[PDB]
Design an enzyme around this catalytic site. Structure first.
Site, PDB file in Angstrom:
ATOM      1  N   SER A   1      43.126  51.778  43.290  1.00 43.11           N
ATOM      2  CA  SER A   1      42.665  52.039  44.630  1.00 43.11           C
ATOM      3  C   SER A   1      41.876  53.315  44.542  1.00 43.11           C
ATOM      4  O   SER A   1      42.066  54.103  43.625  1.00 43.11           O
ATOM      5  CB  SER A   1      43.870  52.226  45.570  1.00 43.11           C
ATOM      6  OG  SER A   1      43.448  52.762  46.804  1.00 43.11           O
TER       7      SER A   1
ATOM      8  N   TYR B   1      52.606  55.568  48.359  1.00 41.61           N
ATOM      9  CA  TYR B   1      51.555  54.641  47.948  1.00 41.61           C
ATOM     10  C   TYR B   1      50.496  55.260  47.033  1.00 41.61           C
ATOM     11  O   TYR B   1      50.177  54.670  46.001  1.00 41.61           O
ATOM     12  CB  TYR B   1      50.869  54.001  49.169  1.00 41.61           C
ATOM     13  CG  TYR B   1      49.753  53.022  48.820  1.00 41.61           C
ATOM     14  CD1 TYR B   1      50.038  51.708  48.454  1.00 41.61           C
ATOM     15  CD2 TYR B   1      48.420  53.404  48.861  1.00 41.61           C
ATOM     16  CE1 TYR B   1      49.000  50.800  48.152  1.00 41.61           C
ATOM     17  CE2 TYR B   1      47.383  52.503  48.549  1.00 41.61           C
ATOM     18  CZ  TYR B   1      47.691  51.210  48.191  1.00 41.61           C
ATOM     19  OH  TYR B   1      46.678  50.308  47.890  1.00 41.61           O
TER      20      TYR B   1
HETATM   21  N1  LIG Z   1      42.993  46.361  51.056  1.00 39.06           N
HETATM   22  C1  LIG Z   1      42.439  47.526  50.671  1.00 39.06           C
HETATM   23  O1  LIG Z   1      41.602  48.217  51.480  1.00 39.06           O
HETATM   24  C2  LIG Z   1      42.779  48.044  49.250  1.00 39.06           C
HETATM   25  C3  LIG Z   1      43.610  47.294  48.437  1.00 39.06           C
HETATM   26  N2  LIG Z   1      43.944  47.733  47.157  1.00 39.06           N
HETATM   27  C4  LIG Z   1      44.848  46.908  46.326  1.00 39.06           C
HETATM   28  O2  LIG Z   1      44.433  45.518  46.349  1.00 39.06           O
HETATM   29  C5  LIG Z   1      45.549  44.769  45.787  1.00 39.06           C
HETATM   30  C6  LIG Z   1      45.779  43.474  46.596  1.00 39.06           C
HETATM   31  O3  LIG Z   1      46.256  43.814  47.953  1.00 39.06           O
HETATM   32  P1  LIG Z   1      45.414  43.299  49.261  1.00 39.06           P
HETATM   33  O4  LIG Z   1      44.634  42.098  48.898  1.00 39.06           O
HETATM   34  O5  LIG Z   1      44.732  44.454  49.901  1.00 39.06           O
HETATM   35  O6  LIG Z   1      46.620  42.954  50.263  1.00 39.06           O
HETATM   36  P2  LIG Z   1      47.297  41.522  50.520  1.00 39.06           P
HETATM   37  O7  LIG Z   1      48.663  41.753  51.083  1.00 39.06           O
HETATM   38  O8  LIG Z   1      46.314  40.638  51.196  1.00 39.06           O
HETATM   39  O9  LIG Z   1      47.562  40.926  49.048  1.00 39.06           O
HETATM   40  C7  LIG Z   1      48.891  41.066  48.543  1.00 39.06           C
HETATM   41  C8  LIG Z   1      49.123  40.066  47.431  1.00 39.06           C
HETATM   42  O10 LIG Z   1      50.182  40.591  46.593  1.00 39.06           O
HETATM   43  C9  LIG Z   1      51.217  39.610  46.529  1.00 39.06           C
HETATM   44  N3  LIG Z   1      52.531  40.183  46.239  1.00 39.06           N
HETATM   45  C10 LIG Z   1      53.142  41.142  46.964  1.00 39.06           C
HETATM   46  N4  LIG Z   1      54.335  41.422  46.436  1.00 39.06           N
HETATM   47  C11 LIG Z   1      54.483  40.631  45.363  1.00 39.06           C
HETATM   48  C12 LIG Z   1      55.489  40.496  44.426  1.00 39.06           C
HETATM   49  N5  LIG Z   1      56.576  41.259  44.550  1.00 39.06           N
HETATM   50  N6  LIG Z   1      55.339  39.596  43.412  1.00 39.06           N
HETATM   51  C13 LIG Z   1      54.228  38.864  43.312  1.00 39.06           C
HETATM   52  N7  LIG Z   1      53.243  38.976  44.192  1.00 39.06           N
HETATM   53  C14 LIG Z   1      53.345  39.845  45.234  1.00 39.06           C
HETATM   54  C15 LIG Z   1      51.187  38.972  47.917  1.00 39.06           C
HETATM   55  O11 LIG Z   1      51.669  37.638  47.822  1.00 39.06           O
HETATM   56  P3  LIG Z   1      53.125  37.110  48.178  1.00 39.06           P
HETATM   57  O12 LIG Z   1      53.769  37.952  49.353  1.00 39.06           O
HETATM   58  O13 LIG Z   1      52.965  35.680  48.529  1.00 39.06           O
HETATM   59  O14 LIG Z   1      54.108  37.352  46.953  1.00 39.06           O
HETATM   60  C16 LIG Z   1      49.695  38.847  48.143  1.00 39.06           C
HETATM   61  O15 LIG Z   1      49.268  37.680  47.463  1.00 39.06           O
HETATM   62  C17 LIG Z   1      46.800  45.637  45.976  1.00 39.06           C
HETATM   63  O16 LIG Z   1      47.301  46.093  44.702  1.00 39.06           O
HETATM   64  C18 LIG Z   1      46.276  46.795  46.846  1.00 39.06           C
HETATM   65  O17 LIG Z   1      47.043  47.996  46.651  1.00 39.06           O
HETATM   66  C19 LIG Z   1      43.423  48.960  46.675  1.00 39.06           C
HETATM   67  C20 LIG Z   1      42.570  49.704  47.497  1.00 39.06           C
HETATM   68  C21 LIG Z   1      42.251  49.254  48.780  1.00 39.06           C
END
Ligand SMILES: NC(=O)C1=CN([C@@H]2O[C@H](COP(=O)(O)OP(=O)(O)OC[C@H]3O[C@@H](n4cnc5c(N)ncnc54)[C@H](OP(=O)(O)O)[C@@H]3O)[C@@H](O)[C@H]2O)C=CC1
Ligand SMILES: NC(=O)C1=CN([C@@H]2O[C@H](COP(=O)(O)OP(=O)(O)OC[C@H]3O[C@@H](n4cnc5c(N)ncnc54)[C@H](OP(=O)(O)O)[C@@H]3O)[C@@H](O)[C@H]2O)C=CC1
Ligand SMILES: NC(=O)C1=CN([C@@H]2O[C@H](COP(=O)(O)OP(=O)(O)OC[C@H]3O[C@@H](n4cnc5c(N)ncnc54)[C@H](OP(=O)(O)O)[C@@H]3O)[C@@H](O)[C@H]2O)C=CC1
Ligand SMILES: NC(=O)C1=CN([C@@H]2O[C@H](COP(=O)(O)OP(=O)(O)OC[C@H]3O[C@@H](n4cnc5c(N)ncnc54)[C@H](OP(=O)(O)O)[C@@H]3O)[C@@H](O)[C@H]2O)C=CC1
Lengths: 238, 218, 239, 218
Positions: B131, B144
């Site tokens: 991030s 975070y």
């Molecule tokens: N959105 C933003 O502005 C930014 C995002 N990021 C990073 O992008 C990455 C994706 O997040 P983002 O798309 O934003 O948010 P979302 O919540 O849309 O995506 C989250 C994904 O992670 C999965 N997930 C969560 N916990 C688990 C787990 N314990 N095991 C397996 N899968 C898991 C969720 O699926 P499920 O619950 O079905 O398991 C979901 O598919 C993250 O690492 C986030 O920190 C970095 C900077 C900025």
């Protein structure tokens, strides 16, 4: 397609970037001291001017007379630079001055040449060629690292301030690229040590590897800003 | 084309990455807890498994099972992550525990799943979603930011250590992407996905170590 | 009678040295570690010792409450407890990552939360987190430990900005190469040997007290002066 | 005790450092352009010379002259610096030129003046005054932040290269100090000076690589 200005286009990374931008159909202004090597590139659509980027007046002028032909510069790639390696205890002090003059003040000249207009029209992209040496330190690189960290800081600071005018500022941070750079260093022993390092790596980036990244960053929609792309041979270690 | 494993592919960034890699012709292993949303992406040549990345045994087994079908994973995108905001003085402490487990430990699990075999064939790409919060701090984001700074350091450290094996380790650092994370200075998930794909698609000997990206504005 | 200072990991190494200096300055102390007998064998005056695992938040918190009944509100906590389990990510036992993040990060977060609301209310107090130059820089075999220490750096900076207006201080102390028990917890005898030869090769290394003098100096500044970071290492340290 | 050279000693931080080192019993060389402010400090055992740090010849000569009197310099404090604020799109370019010349080349001049002899002695301390602006960007400060990031990198690099010679290189990074720079919530110059003295006074084998400090508030 919109005019793109590139400094240091006469060899190395800048040459490679010119080729890619030309091939995408951008008219170009290419700036370097070796203006006949610029001409020998033979690119379409493509003004060559003999400019030292530390000469702000000649610099700005070249730009103004190129926009009289192709319209407002939508991008400048501040690429011109030099690497004079050395130990701070012995290195000729005038090598520090020359490097800071081109690598930093030259680049600032480049930014100021376009920044006012870009802000006014809410469009434009500044692409500054920094280095992973702008990110970490390397043996014999003290003064050069100084210029590249300054470039990194300058870029981030301006990016924050021109965000609201929808202007993009990009930092491209290569390591180990096959170019003329290393050849300007004063010490034969340092150059030999450096050349053996890159050989031992299994070799090194091609200029075009940096160019593809630069073009990819630029080609994103105006509302998407790739702030930084850092790249290096995979096998690069200490 | 070679197998690619994507964690957190049930929404947001990971979904958009899955779509781009699928369109490019890669068979996929998609991992996430809501397996039914994975199934619903209905992507060709795509295995969907219900895996919580903190569960190391189920994670490893899913990958093994997938490599039997499409052969060894040439990339893993460690994208699963969660954002629980709060002030340190009052934030529920289990939130810290859970975030680090998912965002850091889960990511370490993914790296360890592929690292040894990748080194042994001198090929492979690990792509970690950090991030811009892994490079700078923000109000309400302390724990975070912690996880993402952890991800940056682990990625840098591991990259230096596998370089000699021709294995690539890349950090993607987005900011302000429209996704479920919170659940025109916003990014589309697909803005992240094009960058991830562009980095993976460079010749093996070219490593894009980092791409940080954000909306021009805000 | 000066203000109470809480110190975690006081049973050896940097924490023990920090306790001696603060004791000498006349601070009453609460010392926290799992080896509570080693704590007691320090024999410091005005010093409460308590068997606490900093990953056990309830005990942690409680031990603090019991010490503030005697000595008043904790004006400082030194989040010092930590461990370094070195290894390659391809082969390292995953449970080493968990234990290390639990102490070096969650432990320290527990420590911060124990004191932060009260400090903010009275507008006084100092949080001193022991990070590492490995929180700033990477090192062979340190991937997971570097992770914990960058996280500590980020957490510290983020909290520092947030409690600034309440006149609370948050300090990061980033040592490298200090003679302590730390390296001995690593799993691989090969890594330990390589590391020990590295410290020999540079001419030896910091004493624990070198870190303790910096911690005390940062803390002794007037409340309105915040030394955000002190990084220190043997002069002869390099790769 | 051993000679200490301090640049920019005519006001602010450099003055406060001079007072602390003098009170601790070091003879001093004070360098700056307003030599009469230096003399007006009236400190014991203190040579006041009129030197622009960008003027390499006069700089080196002043140090040579001082070392004849009091022996080789055991520390130099590269504190001379200036802050010209502006937006890059309009800022007078000569301001950049002069800031970099003073803040960076001046400092390099000071390092080169003592480095080889210190290496040969296997002893010595270089103390560079950076800024929290050398770790962090700020509105209006682009070119100035540039100079201080340069000072951080140069300091880190030179520290690594002279470590084997038992020579210490230290970066002090203050913020918001009441001085003439700008010509609570605010630091006194003496807050900086106490940190600088504390770092120098550690055993030679202990190198405080960096101290960053600022007002608790604001
Ligand atoms: N959105 C933003 O502005 C930014 C995002 N990021 C990073 O992008 C990455 C994706 O997040 P983002 O798309 O934003 O948010 P979302 O919540 O849309 O995506 C989250 C994904 O992670 C999965 N997930 C969560 N916990 C688990 C787990 N314990 N095991 C397996 N899968 C898991 C969720 O699926 P499920 O619950 O079905 O398991 C979901 O598919 C993250 O690492 C986030 O920190 C970095 C900077 C900025
Ligand atoms: N090669 C590498 O490993 C890396 C390079 N970089 C950066 O890439 C950029 C380009 O260098 P690279 O291509 O490698 O090296 P080259 O020496 O091949 O190219 C340098 C370019 O800059 C031009 N130039 C130099 N001084 C001036 C000047 N005063 N005015 C105008 N143009 C000038 C040169 O043209 P001419 O002499 O004709 O004026 C030439 O076109 C530099 O900033 C370098 O620091 C960053 C990381 C790694
Ligand atoms: N030594 C060095 O070269 C460097 C050390 N550091 C940091 O210094 C800090 C102190 O380590 P150092 O003194 O070197 O090593 P030591 O192993 O000597 O000390 C570690 C201390 O932490 C305590 N501790 C460990 N786990 C727990 C726990 N779960 N709960 C409560 N206390 C615990 C140990 O006590 P007990 O087992 O009795 O509970 C011991 O007192 C660590 O955070 C380390 O990361 C940073 C940079 C360099
Ligand atoms: N004040 C603050 O909040 C912060 C300051 N700093 C750094 O502290 C250092 C000292 O500045 P500060 O005390 O704040 O401001 P002052 O203006 O009070 O100090 C500036 C000193 O530098 C000297 N100087 C300036 N130019 C030259 C030159 N060309 N050659 C020799 N000496 C010169 C000036 O003396 P003279 O004109 O007589 O030559 C003066 O003695 C600077 O490097 C500054 O960047 C860093 C962070 C914060």
């Amino acid at each position: 397609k919109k005019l793109v200005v590139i400094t240091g286009a006469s060899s190395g990374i800048g040459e490679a970037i010119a080729r890619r931008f030309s091939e995408e159909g951008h008219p170009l202004l290419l700036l370097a001291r070796r203006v006949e090597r610029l001409k020998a590139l033979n690119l379409p659509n493509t003004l060559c001017a003999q400019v030292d980027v530390t000469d702000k007046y000649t610099f700005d002028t070249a730009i103004t007379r190129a926009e009289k032909i192709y319209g407002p510069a939508d991008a400048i790639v501040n690429n011109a630079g030099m690497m004079l390696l050395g130990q701070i205890d012995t290195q000729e002090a005038n090598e520090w001055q020359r490097m800071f003059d081109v690598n930093v003040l030259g680049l600032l000249n480049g930014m100021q040449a376009v920044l006012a207009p870009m802000k006014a029209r809410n469009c434009g992209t500044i692409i500054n060629i920094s280095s992973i040496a702008g990110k970490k330190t390397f043996p014999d690189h003290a003064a050069y690292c100084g210029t590249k960290f300054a470039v990194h800081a300058i870029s981030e600071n301006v990016r924050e301030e021109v965000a609201a005018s929808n202007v993009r500022v990009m930092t491209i941070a290569p390591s180990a690229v096959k170019t003329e750079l290393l050849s300007h260093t004063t010490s034969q022993q340092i150059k030999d040590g450096y050349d053996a390092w890159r050989v031992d790596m299994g070799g090194v980036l091609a200029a075009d590897d940096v160019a593809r990244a630069v073009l990819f960053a630029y080609q994103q929609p105006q509302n998407v800003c790739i702030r930084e792309i850092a790249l290096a041979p995979t096998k690069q270690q200490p």
